[PDB]
């Protein structure tokens, strides 16, 4: 051990450390500076950036031996605090740079280091700095972050007053549609919002820390577990196995379709008889620390009989493949789509037909924060779980039978969380921590490392697709055929539903009167499927939007004009036979057209012999809602102090549940003149908030926003005075009148898609958009650079523009990754950010352009649709279409790795 | 477990707690708010004061079940931080209220609660508030704290500007003699100075926490130790016993006198053969937490054979008493005093003689911070100990042979510490933590609780005394006889030296030409003796100053005038035959006289039938130095940045080592124009600071102040330019000239007292003072209230008046405790602050008056003497003399408990 006397955030610290200890651990654990966020633990994400003697360093890869006596360290806590915010912090708030907020401390500290060395950076200097310092963000697409740095720099430089970093209320006092900052932003930019790992450090000494004993093969029969050596190791309390599970030891898929061949009870909590994928949790070590638990987990010996593993859909779907779940066929679900007339004769007589085989793979969500959860037995006898769940009520019912609790004896709560992008539509750690809390009686905390985040959370499910179009010479679509095979890994939850998305979204955007297709879901031993932002549309619309460009090419037609010819107009129906609710695609195309023509001309002018430029288009469509007559509930409560609490379970991945609640409620409460800062939101909790439903399907703004609107309307009625005006809280309580008022809303017009035909009215609101990608391909290397992305977006009406702009930039950035670099195919190689192709800032162009073309929705609150998934529906199709424009090469199977593009260029 | 969402220091906290957990633990451990200080753990000291929903509560006795959802908590961290100080914090700094600083957070938080309820308190309101909230201070005597509150209130009230709470540099730029604030004050008032328990919370996860397995009888032969059950308990690493000690397993007294009958090697590190007092450490449990170590220590079984214990000096000194240390007589040392002619014939022919039997007991130091230390093996192979040692070099040599290390393989460092008042002149925990670090190889931390602080740290040693005077009718002293028996408990360190103090200080102040006396030191089984501020003078001068009043009464003379007749004047010698160095007692008496006469008149006027007022006087004298030719060393270094570091081992109990260094160096550096904020001090460290010696014997200002002066003079010479002016650092390094310059100083005129006669010149500087106490006795109850204390003090020259005023107020307050309430006699009953008679604020009058009558010392730096022990030399004699004035009752045996006074009143 060594004494080191240094200065941390301006205060001398008399530190006692191991010279080998990591600075991140010292700062977080020894000094309580949980504003230093740790994600990857491998120097790749920047979340743990600190200033050490004027240099920005990653604390997770800086050992204390590198910190000299007398060193100066700055963490986010030393940059500024609430009510003493630094210009960078104020600018982050103003520009909406904290979505999940997990990266915000690191970017802000890194940015302070930049500005301390270069006071007046260009935007490119900012981008170069964040690239060099590895500052990674999965939510924002980086542009808002650069905007904030530039604004802060101008203030620090004396070029504008610091008061200009403070939001200015609009003339009219309307926050709906504005750039009002989100309530959580101050806590995020100051490092004072505690995420699950932070909470773990702040839990009491009795708390047990868990480590998973995981399968290191993809498929096996388990013969036994030997915990004997582990129990002798430092700090070990016990080891938990399936024998300690008090219920069924299975998670239920809950809404398994009747025509699914499986019962939906396939997924274990703790493996008993089999390993179904690499990473499956077989046991939990409970210890006094994460480090001691992990060391002991390495010593638990699992005796198993390895089985041949099926590592892709086609392999598992073979007629003679062995059933992974004995008694259920590996191909466990099929969804037909049968619209209009038989397609065979139409293809035979059509002027033009095209066909393609396409693939979209196992995209990894890659939030900067790896999965984390904790649980405890309450003094009320209930088991409480605090996790990254984005569907607390849903998950309660998915896990309760398996853990052995009645629903009223379990409570799920959503912690502040550092992004999910859908992986938290699935249970991950909740049942594990519940079982351990119940078995031990003690609080328990489980933190995944980044390799566990990659290997042992769910993934976008790969689809192998064949799609065909028949059309007239003038470009009018006549018919479509489709076939898709969904590799869902071993656990069925929502896999049938995902397969149904292909019936809904392959070919969406256009009038297609005649469709015949079939989706199939197959169990494999690769990673199980969890929703990933877009949930079936990125697969579906990659196929159809690429195929539209192939049709245009075969016709000799411009691909934007082919889309214009076919885009939904009054009278048309979508693939499930439903009329669109608004008709904004022609408007968006007409507004994009001159920008597209200008981009084509620029691409021609700026292309060189080696660097070929191209422009690509695609359309995106997705529902806002869960299928059928989805619903939500909110409670609007006048508090004694005159504030209003709007109680919901709107789960915040980081997208903005806080501001969505406040903005929607503000607009609904306008007759009573309620200031936005007087409106409070509630963190999701199954015991104390209503069942607003999950934050999936781009649904909360529509469903929960309508419920909030209704609840607030009902609170206004409850407050209205005879003669005009409104009663105060004191007046209402004196009259023994209610102050907490419910509202509900249901998408009553919607119907589930039919099991035989696929037809129905599954959503009452959709999101519509048109993408344009501008790219450069180096034809010597195959490397593609995305130089610009544009989204024409119809969101109906904006609740909050900082929120929606940020949603769109983040989705576009994920689309660049999906197109060019990302996958989870290689269990080890793809288990790091860099290994799996995470998009760092230079991969994302600074030119991300949005044009809102909003057509108010009949059923949306104040006309709003959702936004969350729209920007990932098909940006990757536009990008691949742009590579084709540039070079003549079509990549059919994502991602467009440089060697893959090269091979195609040279063929 | 329960979730509680509350606000702490203005920031929402999502807390996860046990409802039974203490708020102090939650705040310190879970949230890292080590500004919440914990001393007593029993609700008696206020150090842990926090504001909870507008009320000041003691966090150590507040369980989390009492903290509601939505509660608001404020700790010192929420009051203000460095560079954002609250008016209360600024006022504390300005008024010198942070001495050790351990109580400062709690007083400041408590004071904020006061001012939030009563914006314009009277001084009495302030005192009532601190009494009610149990805010305890052992350093300051409370008056500076009240001063600070009143000043802060005036600023908060708009009656004076906040800038007036900032120190104003004197016209001349001289900080010597000024009220310049001490360097450590900001850290203390903000809770950002880490004391040993704070450091323990900030040590890494590898750290083992220790608990002592202690004797629960006073005297025994040990037969065996059974650790088997303890080793099975949660979190236990090992148990350490004497078998793990690598050296002699004994502490050496190091300077044991040749005529001591014992070898000075009597004290074990870990008991092997015997228990010598209740509390002796027999084993150390090492565990993952203090709580788990303590729980397991309760299960270690010690097999012993209890022996009859000698619980007082007279009992142990009996001719037939059994030797506690077999082979050494219990009476192990005697010191004669033989000055002038035989006293028997002089007593026989004297006009007047008086005699008395007096007792001063086992005063407990009662710092607010209980003892704490830690140790580790460095990467350099040395063992490092960080403790409350106030003599790091001394303790290194006292413990090294016992722990089995050569001196260069051990390093002792003084942590910031919450007071000692002398108990840390002894080793307490240093050898224990070293043995555990060496045995385990791991960092180890040991925190005593308050009962262990009381039972198992050393004490003022009781003296049983008989003193006699012979005098002329005119009051001239002719002769003195003296006999004293010192109960030193079982461990000999410095017990012979303490006994020698009686030869030096019984009768000090007056010319006494003929003295015959004998002191004896006896081992007992009550608590071992450790220095307590005054070290022999409180005992000695209680006897002689009470006896002077008895002589005055027998002569019918005024007691101030009797002192005036006899006080040292040129030509006189002190008891050891040495001439005083200055002669300030007549001056001080002449300046006190009219105040004394006025106080007598007030006492007569304001007395009532039931409440009798009186006034008492005493003189105090003590040396500044260790006996003989004491010495110190300092290094003055010009740093590259133009600051100057003055390297010393001046150990800071809280008295002001920091400001003593800075002020002394500033004065010495004046020719070079060095600003005080450019002067740095060093925390004591045996490896990297010079052997300046211990902070005992009121010596550092004289010895180390002279060494600092010399070092700085030598640095000036090293910097002087040819032609005038001074070279800069850069100029010196360019010339390859030295920048770090040594200075030494020795008290060359001093000689050790003779073993046969007691005569010698033991100190070259003494401190001189005259006390006046004003008291009221309720003759129905025997309760005494001290209404005022005055000290006339000759300190030569003041280095810093905030420091010296505070020293005097604190010593006067300890004198009130010694006189009226304090003891450590009953092992259990006296093991709490309240049980042992700690003086809370109402016991200490607001009227504490100082008059400096400074006579520059020939050998002191800039004329200074020490101050530390002067105010405790005899205030308790003045108080008992005042009770006698009031009531006619003399209390001979301290303390003057109410029942004791009543019995005397009624006899
Ligand atoms: N018009 C409009 C719309 C919307 N908004 C906004 O925006 C947001 C969003 O919304 P939405 O769309 O409704 O959604 P939500 O439901 O809330 O959420 C969810 C989503 O969200 C997204 N985004 C995001 N972001 C972030 N940051 N992070 C994340 O993680 C995430 N995730 C993702 C996903 S995947 Mo799934 O689960 O697969 O199905 S679906 C999803 C919010 O804040 C709201 O309020 C506005 O403002 N306006
Ligand atoms: N003239 C003069 C003198 C002095 N000063 C200051 O005052 C202080 C003190 O000093 P001194 O006297 O020199 O002393 P020191 O050595 O430093 O110290 C020690 C002491 O100190 C005291 N005080 C105190 N305070 C407090 N707060 N706390 C404590 O704990 C204490 N302790 C106590 C004791 S006990 Mo022995 O150890 O028994 O012998 S001794 C003693 C310092 O700060 C200094 O600087 C000045 O200013 N001036
Ligand atoms: O409706 C449910 O209960 C879950 C529906 C769902 C699950 C995963 C992605 C989209 C919709
Ligand atoms: O001189 C030493 O080595 C210790 C001298 C001492 C010890 C305890 C109190 C006063 C002086
Ligand atoms: S770079 Fe340190 S946690 Fe990712
Ligand atoms: S805001 Fe950057 S990772 Fe979420
Ligand atoms: S009153 Fe709480 S530590 Fe003393
Ligand atoms: S300053 Fe109050 S206890 Fe030391
Ligand atoms: Cl391909
Ligand atoms: Cl490649
Ligand atoms: Cl008595
Ligand atoms: Cl009593
Ligand atoms: Mg500022
Ligand atoms: Mg038509
Ligand atoms: Mg590959
Ligand atoms: Mg190749
Ligand atoms: Mg202020
Ligand atoms: Mg004379
Ligand atoms: Mg008694
Ligand atoms: Mg009695």
From Swiss-Prot, chains A, B:
Annotated InterPro entries: 2Fe-2S-bd, 2Fe-2S-bd_dom_sf, 2Fe-2S_ferredoxin-like_sf, 2Fe-2S_ferredoxin-type, 2Fe2S_fd_BS, Ald_Oxase/Xan_DH_a/b, Ald_Oxase/Xan_DH_a/b_sf, Ald_Oxase/xanthine_DH-like
A Pfam family matched in the record: MoCoBD_1
Binding-site residues for Mo-molybdopterin cytosine dinucleotide, renumbered to this chain: 653, 869
UniProt keyword annotation of Metal-binding present: yes
UniProt: [2Fe-2S] cluster 2 binding residues: 100, 103, 137, 139
Highest taxon of the lineage: Bacteria
UniProt entry keywords in alphabetical sequence: 2Fe-2S, FAD, Flavoprotein, Iron, Iron-sulfur, Metal-binding, Molybdenum, NAD, Oxidoreductase
Class of the enzyme per the UniProt entry, highest EC level: oxidoreductase
Designated name of the protein: Aldehyde oxidoreductase
Source species of the chain: Megalodesulfovibrio gigas (Desulfovibrio gigas)
Name of encoding gene: mop
